[PDB]
Amino acid sequence: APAAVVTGAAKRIGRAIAVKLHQTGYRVVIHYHNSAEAAVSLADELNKERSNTAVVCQADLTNSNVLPASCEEIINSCFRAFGRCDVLVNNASAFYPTPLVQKTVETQVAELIGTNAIAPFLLTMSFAQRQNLSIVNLCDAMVDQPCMAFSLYNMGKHALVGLTQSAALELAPYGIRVNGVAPGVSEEEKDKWRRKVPLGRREASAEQIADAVIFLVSGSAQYITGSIIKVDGGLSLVHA
Amino acid sequence: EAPAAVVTGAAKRIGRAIAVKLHQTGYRVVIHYHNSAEAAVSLADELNKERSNTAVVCQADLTNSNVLPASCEEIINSCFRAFGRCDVLVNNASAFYPTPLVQKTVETQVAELIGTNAIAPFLLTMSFAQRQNLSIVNLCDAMVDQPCMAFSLYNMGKHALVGLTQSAALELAPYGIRVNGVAPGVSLLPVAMGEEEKDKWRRKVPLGRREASAEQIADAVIFLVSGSAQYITGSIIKVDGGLSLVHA
Amino acid sequence: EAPAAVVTGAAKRIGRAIAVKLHQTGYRVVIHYHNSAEAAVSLADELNKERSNTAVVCQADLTNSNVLPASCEEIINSCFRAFGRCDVLVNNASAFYPTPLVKTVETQVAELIGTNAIAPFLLTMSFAQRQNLSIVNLCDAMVDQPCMAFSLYNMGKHALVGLTQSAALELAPYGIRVNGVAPGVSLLPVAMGEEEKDKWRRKVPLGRREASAEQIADAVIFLVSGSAQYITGSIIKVDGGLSLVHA
Amino acid sequence: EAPAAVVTGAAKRIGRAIAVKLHQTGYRVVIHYHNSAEAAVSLADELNKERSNTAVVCQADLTNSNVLPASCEEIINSCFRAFGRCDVLVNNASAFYPTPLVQKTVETQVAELIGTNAIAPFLLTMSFAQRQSNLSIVNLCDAMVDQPCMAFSLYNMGKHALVGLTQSAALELAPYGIRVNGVAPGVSLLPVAMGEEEKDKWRRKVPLGRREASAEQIADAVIFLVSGSAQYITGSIIKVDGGLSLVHA
Ligand SMILES: NC(=O)c1ccc[n+]([C@@H]2O[C@H](COP(=O)([O-])OP(=O)(O)OC[C@H]3O[C@@H](n4cnc5c(N)ncnc54)[C@H](OP(=O)(O)O)[C@@H]3O)[C@@H](O)[C@H]2O)c1
Ligand SMILES: NC(=O)c1ccc[n+]([C@@H]2O[C@H](COP(=O)([O-])OP(=O)(O)OC[C@H]3O[C@@H](n4cnc5c(N)ncnc54)[C@H](OP(=O)(O)O)[C@@H]3O)[C@@H](O)[C@H]2O)c1
C-alpha cells in the first residue's frame, strides 16, 4: 500500500483529501500546525477503519531558518511510519489581505510566501531526494483575476504555478509527476460569491477538490504532468 | 437505462479508444466516422458482441458547408434514434495538415480545418443542447501556443475550439451541461510520418520520452464525463507528458 | 520613399483612428470599408487634403466565401497599385453580434469567423506573398472571460490569436513581425443607452472609462514602429485593467 | 519640472539601457546598484555631464531580510531627496542562478532569488505608492517563464510571483492613477560568464533574426509603457522575445 503526505490536513480541503486518499488505499501523514486535536481525531477515524494507516506530523510552515529541516522532517515521518512516500499534497495555505497602501510586512511575507510557495518547494526537494510517484499542489483558479488587496497571497499562488511547472520538468526523469488543482470558490458575503458561479446549482464541496486530487495521483493520470486542473464551477470564465 | 455518448471520428486511434472506454464504463455509443466505414462497423460489432444494442455507427463529413448544420443535427438525432437519450458528446474528429502562408483550394482547406476542428463542434454543441450528468469534451491541442511551422489554419481551428469550450461552458451551465477539453501533446503519431521523425518527437517528451497512448488520452475524457468532475466546467486538461513546458 | 499601410474596416471608430495616426506618422494608407462608403471617402478626402496622393479606398465584404481569397488579394494589390509597396497590414474589421447556442447559422459563421479570422489569414497570406514590415491584428482582451451568447465571435477572436502566433513564427524569416492589440472596452456601440455604457465604464479600474479609439491606435503605432523591432507574436492588452477584474 | 525615475540594478546591461533611455526622454534618474559601484558612478557622471543634476546613485542589497522594507523605502526616499518627486519605478534588478531540486544555504537562495525578483519589487511598489500626472511602474519579467530552464525553480517562482505582483498592483493602484506593467525579455544580453558557443546555441533559436535582443530594444518597450502613448495600459506584460516563446521543443 502506497503512502501520502497531506499538508494542512486537519480541516477543510486537506481533511477531505486525506480521507479520500485513505479510502483509495493510501496510508497517510496528517500534517498540522495548530490543529493537533483535529489532526489526531482524523487519524483516530482513519485508523479505526484500518489499523496503523494514519499518523500525524506537527510543523510550522512559515518561512524561517528552520523551515528546510521542518520540511525534511515531514517527509521523513512518512518514510519512518510507512517505509515509502508515493504522494505529496501541498495543501496548507495562509490567506489574508496585504494592502499596498495604508504583523509586520516581513512576517506576512514569511507566512504567505512561505506557506504557499517556499514550503512546497522545500517539501518537493525533500520528497524527490528521498526517492506511481506524484506531487499535487493546491493552486487558485482566480490567480489571474485576483482579489483586491491580496498581493502577497496572489504572488505566492503564482510562485506555486511556477514550482508546479519547473518541478514537473525537472522531476520527470525520476518518474515523479507534478500537477495542480485550482479551486475557485470552495453568509451574505458567502451567498454573493455562490450566485456568480455558472455551475452554482451544485454547492462547492471539499470532496469535489479531493476528487481531482485522486484523479491526478491515479494510474488514469500517468501521462499527466505540469497540468493544473481548475475545479471552480466555471467561475474564472465569468467577466466583471 | 444506460447513458449514451456520441464520439466523433471514432473508428480509429484516439476516438476509437474513447469509444471503447466509454462503452466499458457503461455507455451506449454512436461511432461517428467519415471515410473509415470498415473500421467503424468492426468496432460497433465488437462492442455489440459484448452487449447487444449498445453501439451504432453514423457517417458524416464534418467539413464546413451550408449543410453542415443538418449533418450535425443528424449525428445527435442518430443517438436519440438508437438510444432515446444523448448524455455525452466527444468532439474528437479532426483534419490536420499544413497550410503554408507563402508559396485543394485554400477555401477547401478552411472548410476542412476550421470545419472539423471548430465549426462542427460548435454545431454539434448547439444540437446537443437543443435536444435535451450531461457533458461535452473537446479534443484540443496542448501545443496550441507553440505551434508547428506552417500549420496556421489547423492552429486557428484548435484555438477556436478553446474559445468554444469556454463560451459553451458559460452558456450551458444553467442547463446542467459541463463543457471541458482534453489537450494531447504528442499521442499516436501520424500514420504517414516516418520512423526517424516519430523518434525525434518521442525524445522531446520529458515524462518517459514517449508519446501518449490513445488509452491515456481516453482516461482523461473518462474523468471529465464522470461524477468525479461534477464541479468542473470550462477546464482544459493537458495530457502531454510535460511537452508544452519544454523550451526550444 | 513613404511607407504604406492597409487598414481594414477603416471608415469609422477604431479603424479610422488607426488610419489617421498612421497617416500622421508618415504612412500612405488604404482605407478598406464594406458598407461605409461615404465615411471612407470623407476620410480619404481629408487625408489627401493634408497631403496629396496619400490615401485611397478599397471596398470589400470580408465575409467568408468562395471569392474571399481573391478579395483579400485585391485589397493588398490596391496598396501596391497606389503606392508601390505595402509595409503594414492592420486587421481591424470585425463583425460582432450574439449567436446563442440554444440570418442562417452558416451565414453567421461566414460573417463572424470570416471577418475576425479567415480574412486576416488570407490578407496575411497575400501580404507575405507580395514581399520594417509588420502586421497588427485587433484582438479582444476579454477573450477568456467572454460575453454570454457570443460563442462564434469569441471563437473568431481566439482563432485570430492563433493566427497572430502562427504567422509570427512562420513569417519571422522574412522579417515580417506579427502582433496584436487587444482592447477591453473601447468605443461603445452607437445605440447603447448611457445607463448601459456607464455599467461597463464603472468596471474599468483605470479611470472608470472606456478607451478612446486614439488610445487603441497608439498601441498599433508602437507595434509598427522601430521601437518594436524585436517584438513579434505579442498581444498588447489596452484595457485599463478590465481583464484583471473578477466576477 | 522634469519627472524622475528609479531604476533598480541600473549600473550595467539592461538596467543601464533603461536609465539612459529614460534620461534621453527627459527623466532625472536614480541609478540603484548593489555591488557595481564604479559602473554606477561612471553612468551617473556621463548623464550629469549631459544635463547637470539629473542623475544620482543609490546603493542597496535587495535580498530579502527583516530590513528589506526599510531599504526599499530608502530607495524611493532617495528619489524624492534628489528630485522632489518620483514618477516612475522600474523593477529591473535580479538574481539568477540554478537551484536544483535533487543534489549558499537554501534559505539564502530563497532570500536572494525571491527577494530580488519579487519581494523587493513588492516593497518598492508599496513605498512608491505610499509616497505619492503620469505615474507608472514597470516590472522586468521573463517571456520564458512557462517554458523554464531546467534547475531554475526558485528563479522561475520569483518571476511568476512578479507576474502576480504586476497584475495585483495594477488592480489596486489604478484608483490612484498608477499604472503597473511588465516587459518580458526572451533572450537579451547573454550572461557575462557564458562562452561564445553557448551564446550561439541560444541565438540560433530565436525566430526573428536568430539573435538576442539588444539592451536598447528592451528599454524601448519600457519607454513606451511609461509614455503617454500607454496611458490606458495597465496590467499588461509585453513580450520582447523575437518569437522565442512560440518555438516548440
Ligand atoms: N477554500 C477555497 O475556496 C479555496 C480557494 C482557492 C484556493 N484554495 C486553496 O486550497 C487549499 C486548501 O484550502 P482550505 O480553504 O481548506 O485551506 P485553509 O483552511 O485556509 O488552510 C488549510 C490549512 O493550512 C494550514 N496552515 C496555515 N498556515 C500555516 C503555517 N504557517 N504553517 C503550517 N500550516 C499552516 C492550517 O493548518 P492548522 O489548522 O493545522 O494550523 C490550515 O487549516 C489551499 O492551498 C488554498 O490556498 C482554497
Ligand atoms: N494524435 C496526436 O498526437 C494529437 C495531438 C494533438 C491533438 N490531437 C487531437 O486529438 C484528437 C484525436 O487525434 P487522432 O490523432 O486520433 O486524430 P486523427 O486520427 O488525425 O483523426 C481522427 C478522425 O477524424 C476524422 N476526420 C477527419 N477529417 C474529417 C472530416 N472532414 N469529416 C469527418 N471526420 C473527419 C477521421 O475519420 P475517418 O477515419 O472516419 O475518415 C479520422 O480518423 C483530434 O482532435 C486531434 O486534433 C491529437
Ligand SMILES: NC(=O)c1ccc[n+]([C@@H]2O[C@H](COP(=O)([O-])OP(=O)(O)OC[C@H]3O[C@@H](n4cnc5c(N)ncnc54)[C@H](OP(=O)(O)O)[C@@H]3O)[C@@H](O)[C@H]2O)c1
Ligand atoms: N470597440 C470595442 O470596445 C472593442 C472591444 C474589443 C475588441 N475590439 C476590436 O477592435 C476592432 C475595432 O473595433 P470597433 O469597435 O472600431 O469595430 P466595429 O465598429 O465594430 O467594426 C469595424 C468595421 O468592421 C467592418 N466590418 C464589419 N463587418 C464586415 C464585413 N462583413 N466585411 C468587411 N468589413 C466588415 C465595418 O465596416 P463598414 O462600416 O465599412 O461596413 C465596421 O465599420 C475590432 O476588431 C473589434 O473586434 C473592439
Ligand SMILES: NC(=O)c1ccc[n+]([C@@H]2O[C@H](COP(=O)([O-])OP(=O)(O)OC[C@H]3O[C@@H](n4cnc5c(N)ncnc54)[C@H](OP(=O)(O)O)[C@@H]3O)[C@@H](O)[C@H]2O)c1
Ligand atoms: N538578459 C536576459 O536575457 C534576460 C532574460 C530574461 C529576463 N531578464 C530580466 O531582465 C532584467 C535585466 O536583465 P539583465 O541581464 O540586465 O540583468 P542582470 O545583469 O542579471 O542583473 C541586473 C542587476 O541586478 C542587480 N542585483 C543582483 N542581485 C542583487 C541584489 N541581491 N540586490 C540588489 N541588486 C541586485 C545587480 O546589480 P550590481 O551589478 O550593482 O550588483 C545586477 O547588475 C532582469 O530582471 C532579468 O531577470 C533578462
Ligand SMILES: O=c1c(O)c(-c2cccc(O)c2)oc2ccc(O)cc12
Ligand atoms: O496524429 C497527430 C500527431 O501525432 C500530432 C503531433 C505530432 C507531433 C507533434 C505534435 O505537437 C503533434 O498532431 C496531431 C494533431 C491533430 C491530429 O488530428 C492528429 C495529430
Ligand SMILES: O=c1c(O)c(-c2cccc(O)c2)oc2ccc(O)cc12
Ligand atoms: O463596440 C464594441 C464594444 O463596445 C465592445 C464591448 C462592449 C462592452 C464590453 C466589452 O468587453 C466589449 O466589444 C466589441 C467587440 C467587437 C467589435 O467589433 C465592437 C465592439
Ligand SMILES: O=c1c(O)c(-c2cccc(O)c2)oc2ccc(O)cc12
Ligand atoms: O543574462 C541573462 C540571460 O541571458 C538569460 C537567458 C539566457 C538564455 C535563455 C534565456 O531564456 C534567458 O536569462 C536571464 C535571466 C535573468 C537575469 O537576471 C539575467 C539573465
